[PDB]
Swiss-Prot record, chain A:
<dbReference type="GO" id="GO:0090071">
    <property type="term" value="P:negative regulation of ribosome biogenesis"/>
</dbReference>
<dbReference type="GO" id="GO:0005737">
    <property type="term" value="C:cytoplasm"/>
</dbReference>
<dbReference type="GO" id="GO:0042256">
    <property type="term" value="P:cytosolic ribosome assembly"/>
</dbReference>
<keyword id="KW-0963">Cytoplasm</keyword>
<keyword id="KW-0678">Repressor</keyword>
<comment type="subunit">
    <text>Interacts with ribosomal protein uL14 (rplN).</text>
</comment>
<comment type="similarity">
    <text>Belongs to the Iojap/RsfS family.</text>
</comment>
<dbReference type="Pfam" id="PF02410">
    <property type="entry name" value="RsfS"/>
</dbReference>
<dbReference type="GO" id="GO:0043023">
    <property type="term" value="F:ribosomal large subunit binding"/>
</dbReference>
From Swiss-Prot, chain B:
<comment type="similarity">
    <text>Belongs to the Iojap/RsfS family.</text>
</comment>
<dbReference type="GO" id="GO:0042256">
    <property type="term" value="P:cytosolic ribosome assembly"/>
</dbReference>
<keyword id="KW-0810">Translation regulation</keyword>
<keyword id="KW-0678">Repressor</keyword>
<dbReference type="GO" id="GO:0017148">
    <property type="term" value="P:negative regulation of translation"/>
</dbReference>
<dbReference type="Pfam" id="PF02410">
    <property type="entry name" value="RsfS"/>
</dbReference>
<protein>
    <recommendedName>
        <fullName>Ribosomal silencing factor RsfS</fullName>
    </recommendedName>
</protein>
<comment type="subunit">
    <text>Interacts with ribosomal protein uL14 (rplN).</text>
</comment>
<dbReference type="GO" id="GO:0005737">
    <property type="term" value="C:cytoplasm"/>
</dbReference>
Amino acid sequence: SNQELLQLAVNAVDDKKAEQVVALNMKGISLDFFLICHGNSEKQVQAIAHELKKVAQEQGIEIKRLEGYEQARWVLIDLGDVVVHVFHKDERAYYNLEKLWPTVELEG
Amino acid sequence: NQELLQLAVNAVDDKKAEQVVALNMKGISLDFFLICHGNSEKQVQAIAHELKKVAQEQGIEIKRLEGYEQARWVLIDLGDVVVHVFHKDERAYYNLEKLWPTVEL
Ligand SMILES: [Mn+2]
Ligand SMILES: [Mn+2]
Ligand SMILES: [Mn+2]
Ligand SMILES: [Mn+2]
């Protein structure tokens, strides 16, 4: 998709104070954008994931996937053209997210 | 194709890598992801090295190799095929579900 869903996800995630928000242009890589951020506690991680869900249902966007919400260590919210990854500051795969997957200059 | 994949499966097999699983990334990424694990950091490195050794014999170019020293999660980018050698105790290895069609062997 475009910055419309991405900005939609960035804001939602921003309203809940998600830290280190990073977008990835998954463009040439996957079959568009991957939004990454993290919470400092399992309660904060779920708050973020929920605001994204709440906002997604307001704008009428179909959530294709949502996994790891209960555990709140690595919540994946598939919004289609955009996929959000909300990690817990202590999640290890969150620091190895380098191996996996080109960023996107949000402010622009 | 199965040429590089079988090449990687064998290398990883010579070192006794356990729970070898191939993933068809067709229609997902821009070929094959291969996963397996070692029971110790020494075994994990043995596997990663056999892959490196085999890759240099066949003359295939290793694009990436990360986490070898730590031997908790070694990534060997062989191009069309990317191998992930985990340590049986690595957590991201049990959450590899979230991330992302299992190829037969
Ligand atoms: Mn698209
Ligand atoms: Mn509507
Ligand atoms: Mn917990
Ligand atoms: Mn160690």
